[PDB]
Design a protein around this ligand. Structure first.
Ligand SMILES: NC(=O)c1nnc(N[C@@H]2CCCC[C@@H]2N)nc1Nc1cccc(-n2nccn2)c1
Length: 272
């Protein structure tokens, strides 16, 4: 969807940045209402342009309440990817600044991410960058998945994407089959989801603190896993460990993961 630059008003202040460029807040004149938007603007000082168009192409095919919606793209001063705004920002930064969010509220948010991911798995897309920094909050009780720059639409005849090259990769969120065989499936996004849960219950702390990527691989190969975060319910730590199943075949899919979270969340809703 090609947008009209005259209908977009960008605020000068940056909200953040990545290798791509910056994220800025703006407003888009819709059919009637004005919609607040988050705009990804390329640095471009053609790989980044191709990558932004491929990201746009993925987001255009997705339609789920727990996935960030793309409004469209615009070619002006630079290439821009216009999305609905998630005002409260990334989940890791939010939890670092709001250390009193309850365990019930964290389960609600991670269950919303599992719903978005169950839908992505059903749609045969692999995220490949599923981490708390890429979970954006619309409200303190409404999370959405974003950042589809590494995402891939699976071929009709395969359950995984085989990467040709390898880097720069967020290794700490990657399953052993991604590191060892360059194979990315919805099951490897399940492994990432386990790391995301650990981050959420650790109030946005970095996983595998003080370790190099190679030491993380060595740790996992020995069957070792990160410990239970302080105050994290045993059932949630158990689910993290299940996500962290070394053998992809035995690892659950997002249908099993979302069902476990849903049932635990209803149990919690009952106790409260
Ligand atoms: N649709 C959105 O609203 C949105 N989509 N994608 C991203 N990506 C970011 C890239 C850089 C790393 C974070 C995140 N994955 N950001 C967004 N909105 C935002 C809002 C407030 C603060 C910040 N923000 N960015 C950095 C710090 N705060 C970002």
């Amino acid at each position: 969807v090609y947008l009209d630059r005259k209908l977009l008003t960008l605020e000068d202040k940056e909200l953040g940045s990545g290798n791509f460029g910056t994220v800025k807040k703006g407003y888009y004149q819709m059919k009637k209402v004005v919609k607040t938007v988050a705009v990804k603007i390329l640095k471009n000082e053609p790989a980044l342009k191709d990558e932004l168009l491929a990201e746009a192409n993925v987001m255009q095919q997705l339609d789920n309440p727990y996935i960030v919606r793309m409004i469209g793209i615009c070619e002006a001063e630079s290439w821009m990817l216009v999305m609905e705004m998630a005002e409260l920002g990334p989940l890791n930064k939010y939890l670092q600044q709001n250390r009193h969010v309850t365990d019930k509220n964290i389960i609600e948010l991670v269950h919303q991410v599992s719903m978005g991911m169950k839908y992505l798995e059903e749609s045969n897309f692999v995220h490949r960058d599923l981490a708390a920094r890429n979970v954006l909050l619309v409200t303190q009780h409404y999370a959405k998945i974003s950042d589809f720059g590494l995402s891939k639409a699976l071929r009709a005849d395969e359950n995984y994407y085989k990467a040709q090259t390898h880097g720069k990769w967020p290794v700490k969120w990657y399953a052993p089959e991604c590191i060892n065989y360059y194979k990315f499936s919805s099951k490897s996004d399940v492994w990432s989801f386990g790391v995301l849960m650990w981050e959420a219950f650790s109030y946005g702390q970095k996983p595998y603190r003080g370790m190099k990527g190679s030491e993380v691989t060595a740790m996992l190969e020995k069957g070792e896993r990160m410990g239970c975060p302080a105050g994290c319910p045993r059932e949630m730590y158990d689910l993290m460990n299940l996500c962290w199943t070394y053998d992809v075949e035995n690892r659950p899919g997002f249908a099993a993961v979302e069902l476990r979270l849903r049932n635990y969340y209803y149990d919690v809703v009952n106790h409260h």
